[PDB]
Amino acid sequence: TGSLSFSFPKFAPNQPYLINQGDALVTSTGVLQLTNVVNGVPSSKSLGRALYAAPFQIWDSTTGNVASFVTSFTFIIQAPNPATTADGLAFFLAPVDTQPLDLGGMLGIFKFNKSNQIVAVEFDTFSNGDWDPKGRHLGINVNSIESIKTVPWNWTNGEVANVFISYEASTKSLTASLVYPSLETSFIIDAIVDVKIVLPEWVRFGFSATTGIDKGYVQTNDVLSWSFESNLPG
Amino acid sequence: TGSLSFSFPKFAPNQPYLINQGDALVTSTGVLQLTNVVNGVPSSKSLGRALYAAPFQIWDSTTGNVASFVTSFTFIIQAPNPATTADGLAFFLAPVDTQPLDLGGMLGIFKFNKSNQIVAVEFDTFSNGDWDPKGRHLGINVNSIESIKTVPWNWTNGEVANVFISYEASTKSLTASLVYPSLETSFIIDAIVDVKIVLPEWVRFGFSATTGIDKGYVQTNDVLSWSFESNLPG
Amino acid sequence: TGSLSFSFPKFAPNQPYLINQGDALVTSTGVLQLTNVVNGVPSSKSLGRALYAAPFQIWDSTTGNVASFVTSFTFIIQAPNPATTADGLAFFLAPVDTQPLDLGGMLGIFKFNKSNQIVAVEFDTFSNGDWDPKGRHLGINVNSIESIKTVPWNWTNGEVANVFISYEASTKSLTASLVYPSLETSFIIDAIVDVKIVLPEWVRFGFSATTGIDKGYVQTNDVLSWSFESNLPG
Amino acid sequence: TGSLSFSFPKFAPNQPYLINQGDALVTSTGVLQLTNVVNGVPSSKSLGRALYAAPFQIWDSTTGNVASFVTSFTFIIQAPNPATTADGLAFFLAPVDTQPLDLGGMLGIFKFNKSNQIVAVEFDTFSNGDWDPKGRHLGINVNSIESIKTVPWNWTNGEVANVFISYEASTKSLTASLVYPSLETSFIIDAIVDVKIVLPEWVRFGFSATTGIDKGYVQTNDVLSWSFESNLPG
Ligand SMILES: CC(=O)N[C@@H]1[C@@H](O)[C@@H](O)[C@@H](CO)O[C@@H]1O
Ligand SMILES: CC(=O)N[C@@H]1[C@@H](O)[C@@H](O)[C@@H](CO)O[C@@H]1O
Ligand SMILES: CC(=O)N[C@@H]1[C@@H](O)[C@@H](O)[C@@H](CO)O[C@@H]1O
Ligand SMILES: CC(=O)N[C@@H]1[C@@H](O)[C@@H](O)[C@@H](CO)O[C@@H]1O
Ligand SMILES: [Ca+2]
Ligand SMILES: [Ca+2]
Ligand SMILES: [Ca+2]
Ligand SMILES: [Ca+2]
């Protein structure tokens, strides 16, 4: 039993409230730069992740209760050539000792190991023919790169996106939405996810992003703010 | 400056935390029944509203600050004949002394009086040819029955819907989403709404719903739970 | 089951978030003036109360659960003659339809009617020989003017006091503390209070204060800010 | 700018939400055992600390704002010989890289290094003649083992104590209180502490405790639960 909440209107560099993995770094301007950028231009074969320093308990094996949580964040994906973008950004939950995985289409969160249990909401900017639908899309993933559900997403180059994710334990319902406040455009996806049968009791959480493996298929993956709140009933 | 938050997993009847208007009532089972139902069958020409007992400050004239808030609720709209439904349910904000207005298509929140300023998210089950798009839809309204923006909505007879509404003062962005957790279907709408130039400093808020004026065009409008949270920066 | 929280750094006049009773009023400066003041001088035989507009559920008869809550507020008690002060200020919980009771020593919250169940923390500025200890004191009262426990209080004329009250359902422990931030002085009291066996499921709450009945025994009773938070486990 | 809150009704062992230092450990029963215990009997020369995994921002150098926070926890101090107890338990704030310091009377948080800035509330069970008052006492410390203020404390062997600490930035007021819910006894202390001029922008926080250096002067220092909440205005 327990709870956890926080709010970061921007990110302060060199402060242990985040666990940086791969190429992820925090700029002097307070931006969480998940993937490498060289003189404004994003580089290929990049992978970066950022987890909150502390994990939270998503379910209790003694009481059998499951936590409900919500998280919101703003991010920007900018690309020199809007026709060739890759690979995407994601919010995910995984074991406390989670480490970055495969590059590119794997979004750094997938590589079946029963110890690599993961739930994620993906903002996929490149469709992989072997497991992805057509065009860019939002997706909800459980233990593999192939989403259990997807919906079309009209990505807007360099535009600020506001994301909201919520999980209602009582109905095992995970909802994810993305809005471009400046454009008044919005997208949403929902799926049943039984976290109790997927993830361990305690999990770390945060962001993961990668750029394309092939030249030209690059993009930035910057998070600008982040708030979180969970509650595990006693 | 200030804040307000609450959570009602269900509604308790005969308790002054809600201000009931029109035909609205709370059943012994804890359901907020906005419109009249006779032996299971909803009646026509019904109008009911429910406001939280206390208002909250949505903006401060001294500091110029604007509040950000979120609210979520679950509701059910059941109809004997799914082909003829009317009129809809809405979440709205208005002056503290707000009273029910016109029936039917007006959703009990519209009737231009500068004192009847109102912002609302509507779940419209009947398209009025004079100001509504085709088919059922979600809508964001500011001072009139004609929404500033709408999106198609596939209403599911008697299914439990989860709604989430959020307002980010910094971007004047109002987002509204509806999900049917059991069906994994979802809808969303977003629009710019400058509450500071629309509503007074303090406002009351809650639900309003009406049934059709013509025989046959009836439906229930039941809210099952409600949580709210606002914050006006100092 | 449910929750309620709010924060008022100051009070806005003419806004229905408070239910004013007796002589209570909100000044243009945002001060909650519980008892009458004439040209700076407090008058005798005054009684004023202020309740939050909405009640909250303090315990659930179906689940048997009891809520835990905390509240904090700042207040000032100023008197022309610091040697003759009366009668006091209190924070209390009572049935939703609670109305002001007796003046003076009764603090407007006591008058045995099983329907007038009340729990209160009193900041008593005058010792009534028939039921009060010696000198000014903090007190915890349950159903009567005679406190179940008291502790000495060194009241400081016109000084700003910060009060904190907390109730832990699991241990039925009610704690009340008063601090004069400017003077670094502090006082505290604690007592077991079984709210489940004392109060009804839903209760309204707030402040009550009275001035002395005899000439000269007067004082102001002004609250400057107020925050509250309760949680009833499901 | 930002915020952080959490609640742990008990502690789960082997989970990275806490940073354990010195002899501190979490028992299978969920108790945070700060100092060594051998077969029920606490050992001497022990020192243990526990910090939340993530730090929080206590003040912003760009806006100049200072955070307000509150924390509560329950703890037990049990001793074989209630006549000889040492040394104490404390809640403290310090730089993110804080490491345990001196044993015994230094409570593991003191050793003047401008980089070892620290603010702490101490529950001192042994009076050190060179800097402590008479008998056990609560204390508020800023940069040294000599408290800026103390108050007598009647420690009760093995009894469960509830502690509440609050800091109001606007008045730079730090309040600390201890209550024995079962006994209805209570103690409190308050002092002005300008965290902005004492601590760095970001700080880690938690508990520290030590046992006596001389044989016989031992005691357990167990924390049973912990909740925290801070808010740094934008
Ligand atoms: C499996 C894998 O990483 N596939 C990647 C794909 O995700 C994308 O990065 C592409 C660039 O054109 O290069 C590869 O095909
Ligand atoms: C303006 C107005 O209330 N119009 C209503 C419409 O909203 C709907 O209730 C309909 C039923 O068939 O009856 C009328 O046309
Ligand atoms: C019962 C009662 O109200 N007693 C009051 C007491 O509370 C105080 O106001 C006093 C003034 O000197 O006058 C009376 O004795
Ligand atoms: C400076 C220091 O650690 N002094 C300690 C004191 O704190 C206490 O532990 C005592 C036991 O009798 O032994 C020493 O005097
Ligand atoms: Ca892909
Ligand atoms: Ca319509
Ligand atoms: Ca008295
Ligand atoms: Ca000492």
A71, A229 contact by CB (below 8 A)? yes
Token code pair at residue C83: 């040697």
Residue D7 and residue B149: Cα distance in Å, rounded?
Answer: 41
Q: For residues D202 and D205, give the distance between their C-alpha atoms in angstroms, rounded to a whole number.
A: 10
> C132 among the known binding-site residues?
yes
What is the C-alpha to C-alpha distance for residues A45 and A82, in angstroms, rounded to an integer? 18
Q: Is B1's CB within 8 Å of C9's CB? A: yes
Q: What span, in angstroms and rounded, lies between the C-alpha atoms of B125 and B109?
A: 16
Give me the total of CB pairs closer than 8 Å, taking one residue from chain A and one from chain D: 65
Count CB atoms within 10 A of the CB of residue A112: 7
Give CA–CA dist B10/C2, Å, rounded: 8
Alpha helices in chain A, H assignment, sequence order: 195-198
CA distance A130 to A29: 39
CB–CB of D56 and A17 under 8 A?
A: yes
Which residues of A does the annotation place in the binding site for Mn(2+)? 122, 124, 132, 137
Query: Which one-letter amino acid corresponds to residue C151?
Result: V
- DSSP codes, C196-216: HHHS-SEEEEEEEEEE-SSTT
Residues B44/B212, Cβ–Cβ less than 8 Å = yes
Question: Is the CB of residue B48 less than 8 Å from the CB of residue B34?
Answer: yes
Work out how many CB contacts closer than 8 A connect A with C: 3
What are the CA-CA distances from residue D126 to residues A132, C112, D23, D132 (Å)? 67, 49, 20, 8
B214-B217-B220 Cα angle (round to 5):
130
CA C18 to chain centre: 14
| Residue A67 near residue A56, CB atoms below 8 Å | yes
Q: C221, C81 in Cβ contact below 8 A?
A: no
| Nearest residue of chain C to residue A231 (CA atoms) | C233
Ligand 2 site, residue B140, Cβ cutoff 6 A: no
Residue nearest to ligand 3 atom 14, measured at CA: C213
State the Cα–Cα distance between residues D231 and D167, nearest whole angstrom.
Answer: 11
Which chain D residues touch C184 with a CB distance below 8 Å?
149, 173, 190-192
**How much distance in Å is there from the Cα of C131 to the middle of ligand 3?**
12
Q: How far from chain centre, in Å, is Cα B42? A: 19
CA distance D54 to chain B (A): 25
Using a CB–CB cutoff of 8 Å, tell me whether A4 touches chain D: yes
User: Look-up: residue for tokens 């001035």?
Assistant: C211
Q: Radius of gyration over alpha carbons of chain C, in Å?
A: 17
Between the CA of C121 and the centroid of ligand 7 the distance, in Å, is 12
- The DSSP result for D60-86, as a single string, is -TTT--B-EEEEEEEEE---SSTTS--
CA B144 distance to own-chain centroid:
14
Compute the half-sphere exposure of residue A39: CA atoms within 13 Å on the CB side of its CA.
Answer: 0
The single-letter code of the amino acid at B137 is H
Please count the other Cβ atoms lying within 10 Å of the Cβ belonging to residue B192: 16
Question: What is the distance between the alpha carbons of residues D121 and D163, in angstroms, rounded to a whole number?
Answer: 10
Residue of the nearest CA to atom 9 in ligand 2? B212
Given a contact cutoff of 8 angstroms between Cβ atoms, the answer to whether A177 and A188 are in contact is yes
The Å distance, Cα A150 to ligand 5 centre, comes to 11
Resolution (A): 2.0
- Gap from CA of B214 to ligand 2 centroid (Å): 7
Q: How far apart are the C-alpha atoms of A209 and A226, rounded to whole Å?
A: 16
Instruction: Give yes or no for a contact between D141 and D119, defined as CB atoms under 8 angstroms apart.
Output: yes
Strand partners, D55: none
Contact A164, A147 (CB under 8 A): no
B129: Cβ contacts below 8 Å, ≥ 6 apart:
none
DSSP annotation of C43? P
Domains defined along chain D, listed by start:
1-234 (2.60.120.200)
Give the integer Cα–Cα distance in Å for D87 and D123.
Answer: 9
Given an 8 Å threshold on Cβ–Cβ distance, is B96 in contact with C15?
yes
Nearest CA to ligand 1 atom 8: A212
Question: What are the backbone angles phi and psi of residue B198, rounded to the nearest 5°?
Answer: -110, -55
Instruction: State which residue of chain D sits closest to C191, comparing Cα positions.
Output: D184
Please tell me what DSSP assigns to residue C125. -
Q: Which chains touch B (3 or more CB pairs under 8 A)?
A: A, C, D
3-state SS assignment for residue C160: coil
Pick from A131, A190, A122, A106: which is nearest to A155 by CA? A122
Q: Which residues, numbered 113 to 132 in chain B, qualify as contacts with chain C under a Cβ-Cβ cut-off of 8 Å?
A: none
Residues on chain D touching B234 (C-beta within 8 angstroms): 233
Ligand 1 is surrounded, with C-beta below 6 A, by: A 86-87, 104-105, 126, 128, 212-214, 217
